[PDB]
Structure 1
C-alpha cells in the first residue's frame, strides 16, 4: 500500500541517512518526504509497543512526534524486504540552514537569536521525550520560510537519553566535543550544549569555528566577523572545554543575548519575506 498512498516526486538528497524524496500524500495532498534506508545499512535497532524489530530512528521519531514541536514528525513507516521507508513532514517552501547560510552569509544577530531559540526549544523537546539527537548542526535544521519556523531532522545518529556515559558516536565530527575527541566519552546534555555552541558560531560567523581535532581540544575561539560581546560570551560558554563549565539549557535561555526573541512569524516577515 505504500505506492498507492503516496505520489513520489524528485529526489531531495541522499547520504548517511539514506535517500529522501519529495512526496505527496494522495489522501489529502499533504506534502511529505519519503526516506528509504536499506536494512544492511542499519546498525541500530530497537522495538515497538507491539514489539516488532525496527530501526532505532523509528523508535526515537515516534517518541518525539507526539503533539506539535520544532521536530519533523514521523507520519508513517513501511517495511520492505530490503529496506525501511519513513514518511515525514515536509514544509513547503523550505530550505535547510546549511544552504541558507551558504547563500546568505553570516546571519544578523536578531535572526540568529530567533533561530537559535527555536533550536533550543526543539532540543529541549527531544530531551523531555527521552531522546538525544547527537547530530545537531545546520544541515539538520529546516526552515519553513513562510512561517519562520525551524524543524529538526535526522535522528539517525540519535539515542535514548540517559544519565550515564556514552562511548559511541556517529554524529558529525567538527560538532563533537573535546571529551569525545580525547576520551571517547561524553554525557548527553553537555555534548549537546557543545554542538549548540558550534551551531551558534556558525550562525553568526557564517562558518564553523574548528576544523581539526587539535583546534577542538585547544578550544580557543576566534571571530572572523563582528559579533557582540554578549553573543561571543554565550558561544565561549557553550564551548567550555570542561563539560561541567558549560551552561544548562536554562542558563543558555536566560543568557542576556537570548532576551527579546522575535516570534517565528515576525522573524519571517522581517528576514525571510
Structure 2
C-alpha cells in the first residue's frame, strides 16, 4: 500500500490488525494498523476521535511517536506509525534496578514536556502505561498511542500483547471511580506513578488484598523510599494527590524546583498546518 512495503503480521485481532512495514522512499521502520471503518464511525465519540487523530497526524514532537499517515477505504482505516528500535524504558529497571535520580529526572522531563504539548493541542492520552514509553536507538523517550488511545476498545484490541505490571497503579482514583474525568489530571497521575517507579524500582501501591489495595490508591497512601530527596518527594506527593480538583497542574510541575534542574526545554517547530479538513479524516481516497 502506497509508500510502504509490507512485512510480517505483528498482531491480528478481530476488528484490527497490525503489520510490519518499511518506507521504500526513505528506509524507515513503521507499523501499519488496519481497522474496521464502521466500528469507528458508529462510535458516539467519533467527533472527538476525528479531532484527536487529525491533530496527532500534524504533531511532531521529538518525544512523541509519529503518526505518519491516516488513510481510509470503503471499509478500513489505515494508520502508519513510527516504529522505534530502542525498546521499552522500563527494560532498564528489570535489568539494572532503579535509575539514578538525574537519569530519572531526564526521562521525566521528556515525558512531562511531550504530554504537556499534546495537551496544549487538545490531545489527552488517558491510558498512559509503562508500555507506552519507548526508546529510540539514541535513548530518547518516545511516547506512543496519543490519539489512538481515543479509539473504541474493540479496535484497540489489535492482536498485539498489552500487559502492564501493576495496572491499577497507573490509573488515577477518579478514572477508576467515575465515568467522566479530566484528561490532563489523569495523565499527570500516570506520569507521577511512572516517576515513582523509575526512582524507586517498584510500585507505590502494593497489597495482596484488593480492597486494601484500592483503599490505598483512593487515599494515595504510599511511602517514598529514604533515597528520594526532600524536593523530589514533595513533588511526587503533590502529583499523586488523589483529588483531581486539587492535584497540581502541568504548569506548576514545569515551574517546580526539582523539575527545573538540568531542564533545557526542547526547541522544535510545527504547523503543519492546522486542521481544515477534519471531518474528512476517515474519508475514502485512493
Same fold at TM > 0.5: yes
Shift of 1:252: 0.7
> Which of the numbers 102, 105, 111 marks the counterpart of 1:110?
102
**Is the 8 Å Cα contact of residues 78 and 84 (structure 1) preserved in structure 2?**
yes
Residue 233 (structure 1) aligns with: 234
- Please say if 1:218 is aligned against 2:219: yes
Distance in 2 between residues matched to 1:264 and 1:13, nearest whole Å: 37
Show the 5 A alignment for 1:148-187: 148-154=139-145, 155-158=147-150, 173-187=168-182
Distance in 2 between residues matched to 1:187 and 1:259, nearest whole Å: 25
Residue 127 (structure 2) aligns with: 135
Pair 1:87–1:208, CA change in 2 (3 A) = same
Distance in 2 between residues matched to 1:149 and 1:61, nearest whole Å: 24
> Which of the numbers 46, 60, 64 marks the counterpart of 1:68?
60
Deviation digits for residues 135-155 of structure 1 (CA, Å, limit 9, x no counterpart) = 122111211131x32222113
**Is the 8 Å Cα contact of residues 89 and 135 (structure 2) preserved in structure 1?**
yes
**Is the 8 Å Cα contact of residues 64 and 71 (structure 1) preserved in structure 2?**
no
Shift of 1:229: 2.0
Shift of 1:100: 3.7
Show the 5 A alignment for 1:1-273: 2=1, 5-11=3-9, 18-39=16-37, 42=40, 43=43, 46=46, 56=49, 59-69=51-61, 70-79=63-72, 83-91=76-84, 93-146=85-138, 148-154=139-145, 155-158=147-150, 173-210=168-205, 212-223=213-224, 226-261=227-262
Shift of 1:263: 6.0
TM-score by length of 2: 0.72
Shift of 1:110: 0.9
Q: Calculate the aligned-residue CA RMSD, in Å.
A: 3.2
TM-score by length of 1: 0.75
**Is the 8 Å Cα contact of residues 95 and 142 (structure 1) preserved in structure 2?**
yes
Higher relative contact order (CA 8 A, sep 6+): 2
Pair 1:149–1:18, CA change in 2 (3 A) = farther
**Is the 8 Å Cα contact of residues 142 and 151 (structure 1) preserved in structure 2?**
yes
Distance in 2 between residues matched to 1:107 and 1:14, nearest whole Å: 35
**Is the 8 Å Cα contact of residues 18 and 36 (structure 1) preserved in structure 2?**
yes
Pair 1:36–1:210, CA change in 2 (3 A) = farther
Deviation digits for residues 38-65 of structure 1 (CA, Å, limit 9, x no counterpart) = 4576556535xxxxxxx92x64233034
Shift of 1:188: 2.2
Pair 1:153–1:15, CA change in 2 (3 A) = farther
